[PDB]
């Protein structure tokens, strides 16, 4: 029903940046993130 109804009829970029500076820093070394996780 929803596909038929969907067929018939900014903050986000800042959102993205926010998560995408910490994302590459996490790959810097995964282990530590997991250590952090366990912690």
């Amino acid at each position: 029903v929803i596909p038929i109804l969907m067929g018939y009829w900014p903050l986000n970029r800042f959102l993205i940046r926010v998560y995408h500076p910490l994302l590459l820093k996490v790959l810097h070394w995964p282990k530590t993130t997991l250590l952090v996780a366990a912690l």
Binding site: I2, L5, M6, W9, N12
Partner: protein, 301 residues
């Protein structure tokens, strides 16, 4: 009290407890009889009321009497009521108080008086005699009704003279029977009242409504100066609690709508997400109808 394990038929459990109850009546003592309980429990205490009097005019032993023998059989009728139950008040009691000085004076034993009592409160009928052309039914009076009728209970009688009446060996006074339950309102007035007990598994709310209704019908019938102050109404919570969950459902709808609305910046699709909800309920409520589930904080939850 016999508690049964999860998910057993409330009525099987009874026809069950009934067979066994039969097996045991022989064992247990002479005159005693084990009597089955009502079709409910303590949780079924749905609606309650006190029977107050604004004039001091009405007797507290007269008030329960009005309840036990009128209000009871008007409320018992009601659809899903397992039983309306009197609470407090005072039971009228014809209490004969024996005087020992009067028992030795006439040398009359108690077992005699007691037997004289048992045999002075009945009626009987001797079939039908055809007088005129029609058959006449034949009743013969005999019930204790007047306090006077108690006083002339023939005990000992002498050929050619005066009979000794119960009055000649005891004062017979209408008195309050020993209580086993005292009902009381605030600190203002000790009162008689009743409780409406719901049959297990029925709708308290609806029964309450029907109770209120029948009670407004019966107000025109009670003496002057008696008001029915309701003590416990269970329907209050029902309402308070049922609305609470209806509030959230709406609160959430708006919330989620506005959230989806914000993110999409497109009203149509913001609503396409939205419309998933109205239909959500409709499907949810259709299934409920079938399994046999109803609205309540828990299922609405």
């Amino acid at each position: 009290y016999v508690i049964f394990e999860d998910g057993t038929d409330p009525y099987w459990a009874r026809s069950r407890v009934l067979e066994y109850l039969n097996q045991v009546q022989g064992k247990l003592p002479a005159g005693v009889s084990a009597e089955l309980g009502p079709d409910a429990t303590g949780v079924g205490w749905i609606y309650e009321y006190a029977l107050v009097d604004r004039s001091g005019k009405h007797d507290l032993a007269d008030l329960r009497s009005l309840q036990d023998w009128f209000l009871k059989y008007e409320l018992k009728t009601i659809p899903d009521v397992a039983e309306v139950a009197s609470v407090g008040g005072v039971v009228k009691e014809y209490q004969v108080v024996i005087d020992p000085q009067r028992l030795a004076q006439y040398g009359i034993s108690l077992a005699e008086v007691k037997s004289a009592l048992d045999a002075s409160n009945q009626e009987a009928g001797g079939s039908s005699i055809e007088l005129a052309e029609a058959e006449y039914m034949v009743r013969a009076s005999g019930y204790l009704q007047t306090l006077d009728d108690f006083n002339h209970i023939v005990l000992k009688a002498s050929e050619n003279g005066v009979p000794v009446y119960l009055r000649d060996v005891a004062k017979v006074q209408i008195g309050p029977e020993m209580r086993r339950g005292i009902a009381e309102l605030n600190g203002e007035g000790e009162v008689a009242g009743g409780v409406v007990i719901l049959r297990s598994g029925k709708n308290a709310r609806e029964v309450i409504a029907a109770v209120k209704d029948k009670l407004e019908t019966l107000k025109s019938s009670l003496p002057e100066g008696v008001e029915i102050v309701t003590t416990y109404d269970r329907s209050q919570l029902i309402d308070r609690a049922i609305d609470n969950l209806s509030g959230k459902l709406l609160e959430e709808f708006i919330v989620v709508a506005v959230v989806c609305a914000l993110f999409l910046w497109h009203v149509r699709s913001a609503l396409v997400a939205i419309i998933s909800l109205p239909l959500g309920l409709c499907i949810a409520f259709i299934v409920m109808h079938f399994q046999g589930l109803n609205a309540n904080i828990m299922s609405l939850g």
